[PDB]
Amino acid sequence: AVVSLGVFALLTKMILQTPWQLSSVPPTPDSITTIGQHFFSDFLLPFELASVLLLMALIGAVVLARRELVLEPEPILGEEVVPPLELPERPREP
Amino acid sequence: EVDYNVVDGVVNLTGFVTMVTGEGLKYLQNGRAQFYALIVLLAVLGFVIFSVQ
Amino acid sequence: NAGTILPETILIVTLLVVLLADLIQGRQADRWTPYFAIVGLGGAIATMIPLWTQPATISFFGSFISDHLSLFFRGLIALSALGTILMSIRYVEQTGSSLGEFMTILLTATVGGMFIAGAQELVFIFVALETLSIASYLLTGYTKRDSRSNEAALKYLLIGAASSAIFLYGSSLLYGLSGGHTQLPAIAQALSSESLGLVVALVFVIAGISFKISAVPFHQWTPDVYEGAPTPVVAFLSVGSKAAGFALAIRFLTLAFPSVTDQWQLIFTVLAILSMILGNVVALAQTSMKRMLAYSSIGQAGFVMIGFVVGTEAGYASMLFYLLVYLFMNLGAFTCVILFSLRTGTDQISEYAGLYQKDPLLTLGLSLCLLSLGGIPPLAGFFGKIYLFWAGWQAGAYGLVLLGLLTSVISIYYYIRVVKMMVVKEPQEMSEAVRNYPEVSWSSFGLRPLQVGLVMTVIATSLAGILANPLFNLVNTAVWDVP
Amino acid sequence: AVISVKPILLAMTPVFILLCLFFGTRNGFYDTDQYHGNGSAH
Amino acid sequence: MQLTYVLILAALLFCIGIYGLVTSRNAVRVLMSIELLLNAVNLNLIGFANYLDGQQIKGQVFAVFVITVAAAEAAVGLAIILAIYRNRDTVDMEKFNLLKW
Amino acid sequence: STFPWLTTIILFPIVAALAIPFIPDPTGKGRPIRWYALAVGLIDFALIVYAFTNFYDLNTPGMQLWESYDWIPEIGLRWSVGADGLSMPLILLTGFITTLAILAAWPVTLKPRLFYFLMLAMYGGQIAVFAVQDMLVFFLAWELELIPVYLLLAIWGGHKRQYAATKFILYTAGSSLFILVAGLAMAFYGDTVSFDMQTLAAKDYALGFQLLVYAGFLVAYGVKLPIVPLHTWLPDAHGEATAPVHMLLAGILLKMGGYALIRMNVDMLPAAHAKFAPVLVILGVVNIIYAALTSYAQRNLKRKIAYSSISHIGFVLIGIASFTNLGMSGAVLQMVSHGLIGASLFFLVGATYDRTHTLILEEMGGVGQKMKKIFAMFTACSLASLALPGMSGFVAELMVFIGFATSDAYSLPFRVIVVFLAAVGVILTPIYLLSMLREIFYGPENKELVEHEALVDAEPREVFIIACLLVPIIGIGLYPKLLTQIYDATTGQVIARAREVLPT
């Protein structure tokens, strides 16, 4: 409870004393065209990589949350025995 | 066993305080990643007061 | 202007075919799809060589820079996934999980990392840092039924999604401390007064920069993940995800903070004198082999931060030459950790004893890639420490070199402890492999890339310090592209 | 005048080399009783 | 509504999410507190963009990609909560400190 | 004179050791791979003779086999080899003993593929210490024999192997860093960034700066040449070793600390050597007194000679810190004499343990009745250590005694209390050696003769190694100009360079 209030006392010390460069420019003339011109001129490369991010976040989360009904008792081979869908470094107490 | 043991006392000091520091700093890692989020956020709180002072 | 990202967009096409063939061919793809990702990674390395001669243009409306420093770190992360695929072709096929779905998550972490090195905007830094981070949590929990791998991906998510929100609040402040200006060179022109706002936006971004390189107030995910995660992912997070965090550190703390420079050199000094202590004394009390290489990676991230706090043209060169030779040591030691963890379970020390007569290619490979990690001559890790200490004494820093040397000889004891329990333990003192070692074949699936990944890293560890005259030229060209 | 080391080191060196190559063959006790065995100090 | 009040509110949400990250015992309330941090970031990012550089808004385009990452981090994150729930029969952060001597 | 001679001599047994894993015919124990190590050991020593008898050209100072290549110009380190009169006797000594250290390694059939690898890699790596005129190759070569000697101790050794090898590598690596600290301190002093040993000698360093670098090198070289407060690694790492590992450690490795004292503490740092010379001769005197008393108070035979090796080291340390051309010539002679003498005793201690299997010396007695030729060679090597004239252990100590108390650098009441106290080792060395000679062979009452020591013999190969060691032991003791002719061109320049700083 003191580390969060220490962060909040730190940031409010910053926010109030920092001189912000407020620009008195009339803003946003229908800012849906000024937000989609940025998806293809300025931030084009974040926009294409965010597509690869959503594919990978769909590959992994389908993998991590599916129920393995293809072959559940399948320890496919063995040099020394490894359980299915578990890493070969077996837990051991020294 | 006179002049060796004042430098093998250093072996009993330095070769032992290195291992028991590593067995002492081992318990900084304790699991419970909420504690890991303290030490990350105490470092954020600690490095600003390190740099404005 | 999309010719500067050809090393990364060759990999996105390679990313898609190794995913689509898993849907089309359906686990008969795994007999051919890892070698397509190797030539897809080899074809991404080979297109960085014609980009080396170009005079460092800034493409994509200023949001991406294709200098030699961007190209060096793009090759390190692509070589990191190249050796990771050579390790994981059997390690995750023996787990029963799908091989093509692994290398989709593994190559997304690469193009996340390969785009961090050349990133220049605040928006593109965070998106490419998220692509490396999100793909990392899926990889450490890829086996997904272990309760160590699941607890690894849990604890890495809750610090990873936390520290990338610390990193975002600093990145949001850099948008606000300037008048807009998501560009990092345009930030430095706007802020130079070193107010308290710029210090909070500096500690916040190196709270997330040093999450990936794992300095010890932010290292706490590293030893808990590295024994729970799949061991090739451990070999990738220690080399690829660390070099991307180090490529982020140069492109952020020098392009966007050239005014505030004595502050983060003071913080990364604290981050290095604590990494070399806590990395190389808590590795000293270890039993597991992947957890011993976990605190090893924390301590040898402190050696790379010796060259980062001195701020000279040889400082960042020693930071980059040591990162190159660190690749063929943790792609070599983790290969022999995997190659031993397939022939037997329980890859921990004191189960390694009685080798050198049963698995001599594993024993010679693991020793020469652990001895160089300590920095014994004439191996590649010795010359990496020498140039980090030559550049240390060149500009002050007499206490970092002495702490870099006194912790390197504590580092010799836990690295020679593994060579102790591989060559000096008698044949009446082995725990596993007591007439139990499976008489290594090199003819099954995945073990033939695992041998060419063993052999090529030891050759790049025995000879990469002797023959490191071209590597000192290939690195010192990249440091002309830093401010 | 002084006796120089070079004309007597160069003289004794082929005497030295072809004697170690010969005296390796003539040996005993390290092949027959050998209770030290495969070791050297065990 | 001034610029200072948006950032104090954003720094307060960042403060609340930090308290929710360390004190909460359920593994899903830890994720729910991360979304408080990423929405604390967005309030600076639009609070800045409304008052600083309102013509070519960049912090509103940057606030879009924060929402898309936090959607992808929560989706990946809850699959990790569903993976630890399938093996460990609980979602309780005090019972995941397995790596302790 | 155009062929790379020292570069070949360094890199031949390192390269030839790579064919050791590819040697055919593994007929049980390793026989042809044992002969292959003596093959590329002997023909490597033949090149050290061939480069000496043709292209050394003595009675001139400076390097005489000089090859300054280019390795990393971005750092500034060069592959710069070169042999002057301080390097060339120990370079000739290193090739000589390691040819016999291979030949004494003949019962080693535990891991013979690994053994003769690490012994040939310690053959190229030991010559590489005396030969290189650089700093970051000197620290490379100093730490080059770090792992191929850990693994020599920790595999082939007695009980308390792993304690001895681990204590060794931590003292050795933990003090090698001070070669890197001091070697970088001198190369970045001033404006020139040269790492050459000749260029760093001619640089002018301050007296406050030199006292740091002298204390930096003295903790680095007081470990390897065991200056007595930093000596505790030595009787452990020599108490648990074999006879071929002994002759590389006692015969060669201790001399690298003494060789580098003359290079990097007298030539490069003369003004701090004028201030830290009286502390060395007190440390050299209490090196002789302590080790001779500790040798007499020890029951282990392998540790008795191990502590005896610390005593003869003390005459080097007196002779360096004396500022005399005869004091320095008795310091380099004590390195070559003890290298041959200590190799011969330690080979015979490993020869007696191969028969009796005790090393307790209260469990022995009357061994010389059973074996006669080992006893005949044990006394002839024990009497060599006693500074008995007619052998090189005397003339090396005689030049130190004479060369100390004729020097115009110390006071008369200081010179009396040193030569009195350093000549107690003249009395103390027949105390522990002849008693150990008495309590092993001189005896009617034998051992149990059942459990251990059931066999007794004396091979003709083991006679040959002692015979080859006694030809330079006696031959320098009958004519010490057979080795002083290499020194006096260079030690005439070492003392004269140190003569310019002596009015202090």
PDB file of N, CA and C in Angstrom, chain A residues 11 14 17-18 20-21 41-46 49 52 55-56 59-61 63-64 66 68 76-80 82 84-92, chain C residues 60-61 90-91 93-95 97 108 115 123-124 131 135 138 141 143-145 148 169 176 179 182 196-197 228-229 231 290 341-346 348 431:
ATOM      1  N   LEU A  11       4.444  10.667  -9.199  1.00  0.00           N
ATOM      2  CA  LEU A  11       3.921  11.138 -10.476  1.00  0.00           C
ATOM      3  C   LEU A  11       3.217  12.480 -10.331  1.00  0.00           C
ATOM      4  N   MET A  14       5.553  15.106 -10.462  1.00  0.00           N
ATOM      5  CA  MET A  14       6.013  15.375 -11.817  1.00  0.00           C
ATOM      6  C   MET A  14       4.970  16.134 -12.627  1.00  0.00           C
ATOM      7  N   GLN A  17       4.399  19.972 -11.830  1.00  0.00           N
ATOM      8  CA  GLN A  17       5.508  20.900 -11.985  1.00  0.00           C
ATOM      9  C   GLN A  17       6.125  20.891 -13.377  1.00  0.00           C
ATOM     10  N   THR A  18       5.780  19.932 -14.223  1.00  0.00           N
ATOM     11  CA  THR A  18       6.340  19.888 -15.567  1.00  0.00           C
ATOM     12  C   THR A  18       5.621  20.886 -16.465  1.00  0.00           C
ATOM     13  N   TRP A  20       4.004  21.758 -19.567  1.00  0.00           N
ATOM     14  CA  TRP A  20       3.556  21.078 -20.770  1.00  0.00           C
ATOM     15  C   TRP A  20       3.387  22.067 -21.912  1.00  0.00           C
ATOM     16  N   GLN A  21       3.758  21.631 -23.114  1.00  0.00           N
ATOM     17  CA  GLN A  21       3.745  22.495 -24.294  1.00  0.00           C
ATOM     18  C   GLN A  21       2.369  22.433 -24.959  1.00  0.00           C
ATOM     19  N   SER A  41       0.541   5.828 -43.723  1.00  0.00           N
ATOM     20  CA  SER A  41       1.688   6.672 -44.007  1.00  0.00           C
ATOM     21  C   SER A  41       2.696   6.654 -42.867  1.00  0.00           C
ATOM     22  N   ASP A  42       2.300   7.092 -41.675  1.00  0.00           N
ATOM     23  CA  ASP A  42       3.249   7.158 -40.568  1.00  0.00           C
ATOM     24  C   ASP A  42       3.403   5.797 -39.900  1.00  0.00           C
ATOM     25  N   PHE A  43       2.322   5.294 -39.321  1.00  0.00           N
ATOM     26  CA  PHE A  43       2.346   4.046 -38.565  1.00  0.00           C
ATOM     27  C   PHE A  43       1.873   2.880 -39.413  1.00  0.00           C
ATOM     28  N   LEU A  44       2.465   2.729 -40.595  1.00  0.00           N
ATOM     29  CA  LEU A  44       2.136   1.597 -41.450  1.00  0.00           C
ATOM     30  C   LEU A  44       2.765   0.317 -40.922  1.00  0.00           C
ATOM     31  N   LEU A  45       4.025   0.382 -40.546  1.00  0.00           N
ATOM     32  CA  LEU A  45       4.751  -0.777 -40.047  1.00  0.00           C
ATOM     33  C   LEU A  45       4.305  -1.259 -38.661  1.00  0.00           C
ATOM     34  N   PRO A  46       3.841  -0.410 -37.727  1.00  0.00           N
ATOM     35  CA  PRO A  46       3.096  -0.977 -36.591  1.00  0.00           C
ATOM     36  C   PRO A  46       1.801  -1.648 -36.994  1.00  0.00           C
ATOM     37  N   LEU A  49       2.444  -5.172 -38.429  1.00  0.00           N
ATOM     38  CA  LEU A  49       2.985  -6.079 -37.426  1.00  0.00           C
ATOM     39  C   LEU A  49       1.949  -6.419 -36.366  1.00  0.00           C
ATOM     40  N   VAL A  52       0.357  -9.596 -37.417  1.00  0.00           N
ATOM     41  CA  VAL A  52       1.144 -10.769 -37.057  1.00  0.00           C
ATOM     42  C   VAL A  52       1.024 -11.045 -35.565  1.00  0.00           C
ATOM     43  N   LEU A  55      -2.390 -12.897 -35.128  1.00  0.00           N
ATOM     44  CA  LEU A  55      -2.287 -14.281 -35.571  1.00  0.00           C
ATOM     45  C   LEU A  55      -1.614 -15.133 -34.509  1.00  0.00           C
ATOM     46  N   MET A  56      -0.453 -14.687 -34.022  1.00  0.00           N
ATOM     47  CA  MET A  56       0.315 -15.438 -33.034  1.00  0.00           C
ATOM     48  C   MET A  56      -0.426 -15.547 -31.708  1.00  0.00           C
ATOM     49  N   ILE A  59      -2.726 -18.330 -32.478  1.00  0.00           N
ATOM     50  CA  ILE A  59      -2.091 -19.644 -32.569  1.00  0.00           C
ATOM     51  C   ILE A  59      -1.836 -20.200 -31.180  1.00  0.00           C
ATOM     52  N   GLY A  60      -1.252 -19.390 -30.311  1.00  0.00           N
ATOM     53  CA  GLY A  60      -0.828 -19.867 -29.015  1.00  0.00           C
ATOM     54  C   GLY A  60      -1.968 -20.094 -28.055  1.00  0.00           C
ATOM     55  N   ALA A  61      -2.937 -19.183 -28.044  1.00  0.00           N
ATOM     56  CA  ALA A  61      -4.029 -19.291 -27.090  1.00  0.00           C
ATOM     57  C   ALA A  61      -5.019 -20.380 -27.472  1.00  0.00           C
ATOM     58  N   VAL A  63      -3.753 -23.120 -28.851  1.00  0.00           N
ATOM     59  CA  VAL A  63      -2.905 -24.238 -28.443  1.00  0.00           C
ATOM     60  C   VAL A  63      -2.914 -24.396 -26.927  1.00  0.00           C
ATOM     61  N   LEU A  64      -2.804 -23.288 -26.200  1.00  0.00           N
ATOM     62  CA  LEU A  64      -2.697 -23.361 -24.750  1.00  0.00           C
ATOM     63  C   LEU A  64      -4.009 -23.730 -24.075  1.00  0.00           C
ATOM     64  N   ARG A  66      -6.760 -25.537 -25.687  1.00  0.00           N
ATOM     65  CA  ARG A  66      -7.548 -26.632 -26.226  1.00  0.00           C
ATOM     66  C   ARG A  66      -7.355 -27.895 -25.397  1.00  0.00           C
ATOM     67  N   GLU A  68      -6.703 -31.760 -25.508  1.00  0.00           N
ATOM     68  CA  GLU A  68      -6.027 -32.644 -26.456  1.00  0.00           C
ATOM     69  C   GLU A  68      -6.803 -33.953 -26.567  1.00  0.00           C
ATOM     70  N   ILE A  76       4.909 -40.847 -27.467  1.00  0.00           N
ATOM     71  CA  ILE A  76       5.127 -41.329 -28.838  1.00  0.00           C
ATOM     72  C   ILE A  76       6.318 -42.288 -28.943  1.00  0.00           C
ATOM     73  N   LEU A  77       7.379 -42.057 -28.175  1.00  0.00           N
ATOM     74  CA  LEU A  77       8.541 -42.939 -28.162  1.00  0.00           C
ATOM     75  C   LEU A  77       9.151 -42.887 -26.767  1.00  0.00           C
ATOM     76  N   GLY A  78      10.384 -43.372 -26.647  1.00  0.00           N
ATOM     77  CA  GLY A  78      11.142 -43.151 -25.434  1.00  0.00           C
ATOM     78  C   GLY A  78      12.593 -43.582 -25.490  1.00  0.00           C
ATOM     79  N   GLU A  79      13.496 -42.675 -25.114  1.00  0.00           N
ATOM     80  CA  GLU A  79      14.870 -43.026 -24.768  1.00  0.00           C
ATOM     81  C   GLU A  79      14.980 -43.270 -23.269  1.00  0.00           C
ATOM     82  N   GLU A  80      14.596 -42.275 -22.477  1.00  0.00           N
ATOM     83  CA  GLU A  80      14.021 -42.474 -21.157  1.00  0.00           C
ATOM     84  C   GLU A  80      12.689 -41.730 -21.151  1.00  0.00           C
ATOM     85  N   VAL A  82       9.243 -39.991 -21.371  1.00  0.00           N
ATOM     86  CA  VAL A  82       8.753 -38.617 -21.281  1.00  0.00           C
ATOM     87  C   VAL A  82       7.231 -38.615 -21.405  1.00  0.00           C
ATOM     88  N   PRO A  84       3.400 -37.228 -22.253  1.00  0.00           N
ATOM     89  CA  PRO A  84       2.943 -36.382 -23.357  1.00  0.00           C
ATOM     90  C   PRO A  84       2.541 -35.000 -22.872  1.00  0.00           C
ATOM     91  N   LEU A  85       2.895 -33.993 -23.681  1.00  0.00           N
ATOM     92  CA  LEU A  85       2.624 -32.575 -23.422  1.00  0.00           C
ATOM     93  C   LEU A  85       3.217 -32.126 -22.088  1.00  0.00           C
ATOM     94  N   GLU A  86       4.444 -32.561 -21.822  1.00  0.00           N
ATOM     95  CA  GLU A  86       5.192 -32.158 -20.643  1.00  0.00           C
ATOM     96  C   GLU A  86       6.668 -32.175 -21.001  1.00  0.00           C
ATOM     97  N   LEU A  87       7.414 -31.215 -20.455  1.00  0.00           N
ATOM     98  CA  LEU A  87       8.800 -31.025 -20.868  1.00  0.00           C
ATOM     99  C   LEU A  87       9.678 -32.165 -20.348  1.00  0.00           C
ATOM    100  N   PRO A  88      10.683 -32.595 -21.127  1.00  0.00           N
ATOM    101  CA  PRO A  88      11.481 -33.773 -20.739  1.00  0.00           C
ATOM    102  C   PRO A  88      12.340 -33.602 -19.495  1.00  0.00           C
ATOM    103  N   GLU A  89      12.564 -32.387 -19.010  1.00  0.00           N
ATOM    104  CA  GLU A  89      13.291 -32.212 -17.754  1.00  0.00           C
ATOM    105  C   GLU A  89      12.372 -32.594 -16.606  1.00  0.00           C
ATOM    106  N   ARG A  90      12.549 -33.794 -16.087  1.00  0.00           N
ATOM    107  CA  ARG A  90      11.629 -34.299 -15.085  1.00  0.00           C
ATOM    108  C   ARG A  90      11.969 -33.729 -13.709  1.00  0.00           C
ATOM    109  N   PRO A  91      10.963 -33.500 -12.863  1.00  0.00           N
ATOM    110  CA  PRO A  91      11.241 -32.968 -11.524  1.00  0.00           C
ATOM    111  C   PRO A  91      11.881 -34.014 -10.625  1.00  0.00           C
ATOM    112  N   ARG A  92      12.914 -33.589  -9.900  1.00  0.00           N
ATOM    113  CA  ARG A  92      13.669 -34.479  -9.032  1.00  0.00           C
ATOM    114  C   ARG A  92      14.159 -33.682  -7.833  1.00  0.00           C
TER     115      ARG A  92
ATOM    116  N   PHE C  60      10.275   4.141 -44.138  1.00  0.00           N
ATOM    117  CA  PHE C  60       8.923   4.060 -43.571  1.00  0.00           C
ATOM    118  C   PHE C  60       8.552   5.308 -42.776  1.00  0.00           C
ATOM    119  N   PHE C  61       8.712   6.465 -43.425  1.00  0.00           N
ATOM    120  CA  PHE C  61       8.322   7.780 -42.912  1.00  0.00           C
ATOM    121  C   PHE C  61       9.046   8.132 -41.617  1.00  0.00           C
ATOM    122  N   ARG C  90      13.494 -31.921 -32.348  1.00  0.00           N
ATOM    123  CA  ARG C  90      13.192 -33.144 -31.619  1.00  0.00           C
ATOM    124  C   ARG C  90      12.591 -32.892 -30.246  1.00  0.00           C
ATOM    125  N   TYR C  91      12.945 -31.783 -29.596  1.00  0.00           N
ATOM    126  CA  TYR C  91      12.556 -31.563 -28.206  1.00  0.00           C
ATOM    127  C   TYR C  91      11.055 -31.343 -28.067  1.00  0.00           C
ATOM    128  N   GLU C  93       8.918 -32.261 -30.651  1.00  0.00           N
ATOM    129  CA  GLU C  93       8.282 -33.417 -31.268  1.00  0.00           C
ATOM    130  C   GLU C  93       8.180 -34.573 -30.289  1.00  0.00           C
ATOM    131  N   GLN C  94       9.166 -34.717 -29.403  1.00  0.00           N
ATOM    132  CA  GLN C  94       9.106 -35.728 -28.356  1.00  0.00           C
ATOM    133  C   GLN C  94       8.113 -35.366 -27.263  1.00  0.00           C
ATOM    134  N   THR C  95       7.721 -34.100 -27.172  1.00  0.00           N
ATOM    135  CA  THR C  95       6.702 -33.688 -26.220  1.00  0.00           C
ATOM    136  C   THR C  95       5.304 -34.070 -26.685  1.00  0.00           C
ATOM    137  N   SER C  97       3.517 -32.181 -28.745  1.00  0.00           N
ATOM    138  CA  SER C  97       2.912 -30.984 -29.296  1.00  0.00           C
ATOM    139  C   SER C  97       3.314 -30.816 -30.757  1.00  0.00           C
ATOM    140  N   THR C 108       7.455 -15.548 -34.885  1.00  0.00           N
ATOM    141  CA  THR C 108       6.840 -14.270 -34.547  1.00  0.00           C
ATOM    142  C   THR C 108       7.647 -13.534 -33.498  1.00  0.00           C
ATOM    143  N   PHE C 115      12.462  -6.417 -35.578  1.00  0.00           N
ATOM    144  CA  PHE C 115      11.901  -5.088 -35.733  1.00  0.00           C
ATOM    145  C   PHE C 115      12.159  -4.174 -34.549  1.00  0.00           C
ATOM    146  N   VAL C 123       5.497   4.133 -31.203  1.00  0.00           N
ATOM    147  CA  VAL C 123       4.437   3.179 -31.494  1.00  0.00           C
ATOM    148  C   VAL C 123       5.020   1.871 -31.998  1.00  0.00           C
ATOM    149  N   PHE C 124       6.043   1.944 -32.847  1.00  0.00           N
ATOM    150  CA  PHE C 124       6.605   0.731 -33.421  1.00  0.00           C
ATOM    151  C   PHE C 124       7.510   0.001 -32.446  1.00  0.00           C
ATOM    152  N   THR C 131       5.256  -7.986 -29.615  1.00  0.00           N
ATOM    153  CA  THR C 131       5.339  -9.189 -30.441  1.00  0.00           C
ATOM    154  C   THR C 131       6.418 -10.139 -29.940  1.00  0.00           C
ATOM    155  N   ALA C 135       4.690 -13.536 -27.746  1.00  0.00           N
ATOM    156  CA  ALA C 135       5.164 -14.811 -28.267  1.00  0.00           C
ATOM    157  C   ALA C 135       6.088 -15.520 -27.301  1.00  0.00           C
ATOM    158  N   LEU C 138       3.710 -17.595 -24.730  1.00  0.00           N
ATOM    159  CA  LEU C 138       3.145 -18.773 -25.365  1.00  0.00           C
ATOM    160  C   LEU C 138       4.186 -19.865 -25.529  1.00  0.00           C
ATOM    161  N   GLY C 141       4.953 -21.609 -22.062  1.00  0.00           N
ATOM    162  CA  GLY C 141       3.856 -22.448 -21.635  1.00  0.00           C
ATOM    163  C   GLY C 141       3.364 -23.319 -22.765  1.00  0.00           C
ATOM    164  N   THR C 143       4.288 -26.428 -23.633  1.00  0.00           N
ATOM    165  CA  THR C 143       4.032 -27.818 -23.279  1.00  0.00           C
ATOM    166  C   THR C 143       2.713 -27.953 -22.530  1.00  0.00           C
ATOM    167  N   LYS C 144       2.405 -26.974 -21.676  1.00  0.00           N
ATOM    168  CA  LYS C 144       1.087 -26.591 -21.166  1.00  0.00           C
ATOM    169  C   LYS C 144       0.474 -27.567 -20.166  1.00  0.00           C
ATOM    170  N   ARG C 145       1.046 -28.764 -20.003  1.00  0.00           N
ATOM    171  CA  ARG C 145       0.669 -29.655 -18.902  1.00  0.00           C
ATOM    172  C   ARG C 145       1.953 -30.036 -18.192  1.00  0.00           C
ATOM    173  N   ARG C 148       5.067 -26.728 -13.893  1.00  0.00           N
ATOM    174  CA  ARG C 148       6.253 -25.890 -13.882  1.00  0.00           C
ATOM    175  C   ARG C 148       6.300 -24.984 -15.089  1.00  0.00           C
ATOM    176  N   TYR C 169       4.020   3.745 -19.928  1.00  0.00           N
ATOM    177  CA  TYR C 169       3.824   5.015 -19.241  1.00  0.00           C
ATOM    178  C   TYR C 169       5.028   5.924 -19.423  1.00  0.00           C
ATOM    179  N   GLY C 176       4.464  13.190 -24.325  1.00  0.00           N
ATOM    180  CA  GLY C 176       3.928  14.367 -23.679  1.00  0.00           C
ATOM    181  C   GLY C 176       4.980  15.362 -23.245  1.00  0.00           C
ATOM    182  N   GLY C 179       6.143  17.946 -27.731  1.00  0.00           N
ATOM    183  CA  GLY C 179       4.840  18.318 -28.241  1.00  0.00           C
ATOM    184  C   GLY C 179       4.348  17.350 -29.293  1.00  0.00           C
ATOM    185  N   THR C 182       6.221  11.198 -31.691  1.00  0.00           N
ATOM    186  CA  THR C 182       6.505   9.791 -31.439  1.00  0.00           C
ATOM    187  C   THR C 182       7.870   9.353 -31.973  1.00  0.00           C
ATOM    188  N   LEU C 196      12.390  16.821 -14.045  1.00  0.00           N
ATOM    189  CA  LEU C 196      11.995  15.612 -13.328  1.00  0.00           C
ATOM    190  C   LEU C 196      11.092  14.734 -14.178  1.00  0.00           C
ATOM    191  N   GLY C 197      10.394  15.318 -15.153  1.00  0.00           N
ATOM    192  CA  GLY C 197       9.570  14.518 -16.039  1.00  0.00           C
ATOM    193  C   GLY C 197      10.377  13.603 -16.931  1.00  0.00           C
ATOM    194  N   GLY C 228      11.286 -23.856 -16.027  1.00  0.00           N
ATOM    195  CA  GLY C 228       9.951 -24.306 -16.340  1.00  0.00           C
ATOM    196  C   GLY C 228       9.715 -24.341 -17.830  1.00  0.00           C
ATOM    197  N   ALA C 229      10.311 -23.394 -18.549  1.00  0.00           N
ATOM    198  CA  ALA C 229      10.113 -23.265 -19.981  1.00  0.00           C
ATOM    199  C   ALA C 229      10.723 -24.446 -20.726  1.00  0.00           C
ATOM    200  N   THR C 231      13.354 -26.039 -23.038  1.00  0.00           N
ATOM    201  CA  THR C 231      14.761 -25.656 -23.101  1.00  0.00           C
ATOM    202  C   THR C 231      15.212 -24.950 -24.387  1.00  0.00           C
ATOM    203  N   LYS C 290      19.464 -25.995 -16.090  1.00  0.00           N
ATOM    204  CA  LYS C 290      18.870 -24.832 -16.737  1.00  0.00           C
ATOM    205  C   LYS C 290      18.740 -23.660 -15.783  1.00  0.00           C
ATOM    206  N   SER C 341      19.187 -33.997 -22.236  1.00  0.00           N
ATOM    207  CA  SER C 341      17.833 -34.116 -21.710  1.00  0.00           C
ATOM    208  C   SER C 341      16.926 -34.953 -22.595  1.00  0.00           C
ATOM    209  N   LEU C 342      17.386 -35.355 -23.772  1.00  0.00           N
ATOM    210  CA  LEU C 342      16.636 -36.300 -24.581  1.00  0.00           C
ATOM    211  C   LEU C 342      17.078 -37.728 -24.320  1.00  0.00           C
ATOM    212  N   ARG C 343      18.380 -37.940 -24.121  1.00  0.00           N
ATOM    213  CA  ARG C 343      18.886 -39.284 -23.869  1.00  0.00           C
ATOM    214  C   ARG C 343      18.540 -39.751 -22.462  1.00  0.00           C
ATOM    215  N   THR C 344      18.264 -38.820 -21.554  1.00  0.00           N
ATOM    216  CA  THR C 344      17.748 -39.155 -20.236  1.00  0.00           C
ATOM    217  C   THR C 344      16.877 -38.019 -19.727  1.00  0.00           C
ATOM    218  N   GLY C 345      16.011 -38.340 -18.779  1.00  0.00           N
ATOM    219  CA  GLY C 345      15.298 -37.317 -18.054  1.00  0.00           C
ATOM    220  C   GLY C 345      16.161 -36.741 -16.954  1.00  0.00           C
ATOM    221  N   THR C 346      15.590 -35.753 -16.252  1.00  0.00           N
ATOM    222  CA  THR C 346      16.207 -35.043 -15.122  1.00  0.00           C
ATOM    223  C   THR C 346      17.559 -34.439 -15.515  1.00  0.00           C
ATOM    224  N   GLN C 348      19.700 -32.235 -14.611  1.00  0.00           N
ATOM    225  CA  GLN C 348      20.269 -31.443 -13.536  1.00  0.00           C
ATOM    226  C   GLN C 348      21.679 -31.943 -13.274  1.00  0.00           C
ATOM    227  N   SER C 431      25.536 -41.270 -11.684  1.00  0.00           N
ATOM    228  CA  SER C 431      24.212 -41.512 -11.113  1.00  0.00           C
ATOM    229  C   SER C 431      23.244 -42.048 -12.163  1.00  0.00           C
TER     230      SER C 431
END
